[PDB]
Amino acid sequence: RDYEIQRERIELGRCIGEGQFGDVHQGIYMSPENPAMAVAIKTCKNCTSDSVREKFLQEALTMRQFDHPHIVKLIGVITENPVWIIMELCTLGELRSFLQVRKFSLDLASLILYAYQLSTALAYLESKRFVHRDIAARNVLVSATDCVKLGDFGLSRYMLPIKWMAPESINFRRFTSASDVWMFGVCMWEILMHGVKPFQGVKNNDVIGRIENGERLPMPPNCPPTLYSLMTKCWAYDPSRRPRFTELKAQLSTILEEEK
Numbered sequence: 001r002d003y004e005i006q007r008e009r010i011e012l013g014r015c016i017g018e019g020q021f022g023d024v025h026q027g028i029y030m031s032p033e034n035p036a037m038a039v040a041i042k043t044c045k046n047c048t049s050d051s052v053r054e055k056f057l058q059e060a061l062t063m064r065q066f067d068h069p070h071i072v073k074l075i076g077v078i079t080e081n082p083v084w085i086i087m088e089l090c091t092l093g094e095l096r097s098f099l100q101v102r103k104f105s106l107d108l109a110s111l112i113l114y115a116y117q118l119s120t121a122l123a124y125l126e127s128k129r130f131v132h133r134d135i136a137a138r139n140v141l142v143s144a145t146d147c148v149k150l151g152d153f154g155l156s157r158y159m160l161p162i163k164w165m166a167p168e169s170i171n172f173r174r175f176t177s178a179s180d181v182w183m184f185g186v187c188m189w190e191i192l193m194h195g196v197k198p199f200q201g202v203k204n205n206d207v208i209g210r211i212e213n214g215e216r217l218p219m220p221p222n223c224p225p226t227l228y229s230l231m232t233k234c235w236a237y238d239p240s241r242r243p244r245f246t247e248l249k250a251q252l253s254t255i256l257e258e259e260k
C-alpha cells in the first residue's frame with residue numbers, strides 16, 4: 001500500500017465539522033473506470049508549521065494500524081500543502097442526531113445492534129492493547145441504518161469528558177481497557193436513551209461526588225433488564241470487577257439474538 005493520493009482525485013464537498021487542526025469535509029475520491037467513492041477529508045490550516053504537520057499526520061498513522069468493519073478506515077493522505085487526510089465516509093452522519101430523528105422508526109433490535117457492533121470494534125482495540133479514552137455516542141457515526149462505526153480517533157479527542165469517565169481516570173489519570181469499559185457503558189446508555197446526554201443539568205464537579213456515593217445513570221425506558229445489568233457491570237467502581245470487551249461482545253450477542 002502506498003497511501004499518497006493525487007490531489008486531483010479528490011473533490012472537496014461541504015464542511016461537516018472541525019477538529020484541533022482544521023475543517024472536516026465530505027467529498028469524493030475519483031479513480032479511472034471506478035464509481036466515485038464518498039469520503040471524509042480532514043484539513044490542516046497552517047500545516048507547515050512543520051511540528052503541526054507532524055502531529056496532524058500522526059492522526060492518519062493511528063488509524064492506519066486498524067482494520068475493522070466498525071471503525072472508520074484511512075483511505076490515504078496528501079502530504080503536500082495543504083495537507084489532507086482522506087477517510088471513509090459514513091453517509092448518515094453522527095449517531096446522536098440519527099437516534100433523535102429516527103426514534104419512532106427504530107426498534108429496540110437496532111439499538112442493541114449498534115451497541116453490539118461497537119463492542120466488536122472495542123474487543124478488536126483491546127486485543128491490540130489500544131486505549132481509546134474517548135468512547136461516547138458523540139464519536140460514533142452511522143454508515144447505514146444497520147451499521148455504526150467508531151469515528152476518527154483524532155477528531156474524537158477532548159471533552160475532560162467528566163460525565164463519561166471512569167472514577168480512576170478522573171481521580172488518578174489512569175486510562176486502561178477497564179476505563180474504556182466504563183465509557184462504553186455510558187455509550188450504551190446514550191444509545192438506549194436515543195441520544196440524550198448523561199447527567200443533564202448536573203455540573204461536572206457534582207458528577208464525581210455522585211459516582212463515589214454509588215449513584216449511576218438510571219435504567220432507560222424499554223431497556224431489557226439483562227442489558228441494564230450488563231451496563232451497571234461496566235460501572236463497577238473497582239476497575240477489575242468490570243467485564244472485558246471480549247465478554248461484552250459475547251453477552252451482547254445473545255441479548256441481541258433474544259430481542260430478535
Ligand SMILES: CNC(=O)c1ccccc1Nc1ncnc(Nc2ccc(N3CCOCC3)cc2OC)n1
Nearest residue numbers: 016017024040088089090093094139151152155156
Ligand atoms: C469522531 N468524530 C469524527 O470522526 C468526525 C467529527 C466531525 C465530522 C466528521 C467526522 N468524521 C467522519 N468520518 C466519517 N464520516 C463522517 N460523516 C459525517 C459526519 C457528520 C456529518 N454532519 C453533517 C451535518 O452537520 C452535522 C454533522 C455528516 C457526515 O457525513 C455526511 N464523519
